[PDB]
Amino acid sequence: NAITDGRALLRYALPINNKPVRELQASLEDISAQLRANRRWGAVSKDLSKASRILDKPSQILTSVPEERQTQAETWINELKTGVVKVQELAQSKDKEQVLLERAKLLNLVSLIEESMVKEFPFEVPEEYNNLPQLKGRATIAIKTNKGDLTVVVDGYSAPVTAGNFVDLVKRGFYNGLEFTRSEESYVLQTGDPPGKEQGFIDPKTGKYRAIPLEILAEGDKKPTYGITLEDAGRYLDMPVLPFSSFGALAMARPETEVDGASSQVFFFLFEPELTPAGRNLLDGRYSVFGYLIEGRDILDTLKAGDKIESATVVQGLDNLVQPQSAAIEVLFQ
Numbered sequence: 273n274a275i276t277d278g279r280a281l282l283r284y285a286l287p288i289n290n291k292p293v294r295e296l297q298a299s300l301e302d303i304s305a306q307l308r309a310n311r312r313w314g315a316v317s318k319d320l321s322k323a324s325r326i327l328d329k330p331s332q333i334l335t336s337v338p339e340e341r342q343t344q345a346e347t348w349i350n351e352l353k354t355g356v357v358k359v360q361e362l363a364q365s366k367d368k369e370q371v372l373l374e375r376a377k378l379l380n381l382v383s384l385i386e387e388s389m390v391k392e393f394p395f396e397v398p399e400e401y402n403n404l405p406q407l408k409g410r411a412t413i414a415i416k417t418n419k420g421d422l423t424v425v426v427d428g429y430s431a432p433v434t435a436g437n438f439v440d441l442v443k444r445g446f447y448n449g450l451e452f453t454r455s456e457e458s459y460v461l462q463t464g465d466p467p468g469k470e471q472g473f474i475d476p477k478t479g480k481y482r483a484i485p486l487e488i489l490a491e492g493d494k495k496p497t498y499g500i501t502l503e504d505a506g507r508y509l510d511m512p513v514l515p516f517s518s519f520g521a522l523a524m525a526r527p528e529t530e531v532d533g534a535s536s537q538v539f540f541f542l543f544e545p546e547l548t549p550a551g552r553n554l555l556d557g558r559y560s561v562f563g564y565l566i567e568g569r570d571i572l573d574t575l576k577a578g579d580k581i582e583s584a585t586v587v588q589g590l591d592n593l594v595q596p597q598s599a600a601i602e603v604l605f606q
């Protein structure tokens with residue numbers, strides 16, 4: 273009764289306001305729930321007919337797309353219409369495997385359309401963090417390990433300071449050669465500890481550890497909560513927009529007693545519903561999730577002692593990374 277697909281969490285975290293595209297999204301999302309037992313084909317066909325009816329009125333979606341991007345979005349709508357027909361044909365033969373494969377392609381198109389609706393960064397990051405790199409949008413990072421590639425999407429719309437720090441460190445090569453750790457009986461896979469005396473990244477402008485604030489956007493808020501756990505904000509019951517209950521959620525480690533003590537140590541949470549008890553965990557609202565694994569699920573589960581990151585690549589979204597601009601408009605006189 274909770275959303276556990278990281279791609280879906282990321283779609284819902286897009287700061288958009290368009291009810292039709294959300295209905296289209298929900299109808300296509302529902303297909304996987306209906307097909308988990310491979311029995312409820314009527315509900316699948318109802319989902320596809322609803323999706324088709326929404327696509328029949330593209331203007332109700334395109335009205336939220338800025339005029340610069342409307343024509344790419346029209347191509348995506350056309351691809352969705354073609355794909356829905358393809359899936360309706362597959363549903364007629366009750367081909368669960370192909371319906372699910374095509375459903376993922378359709379939802380990727382929905383994601384692309386939804387992301388094109390973000391017009392302008394949704395809030396002002398506190399100026400006290402203007403000395404830190406910030407990701408004003410999404411980025412996709414491919415992490416090459418000795419066991420294969422992990423692809424993560426990091427969400428600067430929900431965690432611009434945290435995602436910005438990560439993309440900046442990736443670009444600096446900080447993670448190259450760093451080992452993974454996973455305690456014996458643990459669902460937490462960690463990396464980002466320099467093998468040396470430092471605990472994180474040293475800011476070359478200051479000569480000191482580049483600490484980042486705790487940054488957690490609570491459901492329904494416009495601005496992230498900075499520097500305080502949701503519990504300490506009096507909001508223990510409120511959930512993050514980017515919650516922990518997805519396999520491969522990527523978050524910042526920090527000392528338990530230092531909310532603003534993170535820098536480079538990160539962890540993946542290998543969430544498993546089957547083994548997770550009913551009730552809240554000790555992670556949501558306390559540690560900042562800033563992205564999700566979207567490819568490499570089987571690889572992630574096998575990472576352990578001795579494994580390491582060989583390299584990390586910014587696949588998409590580098591242009592969303594904003595370096596500190598405080599001294600960028602200063603005029604010198606010699």
Ligand SMILES: [Ca+2]
Pocket residue numbers: 465466467468469470471
């Ligand atoms: Ca160290």
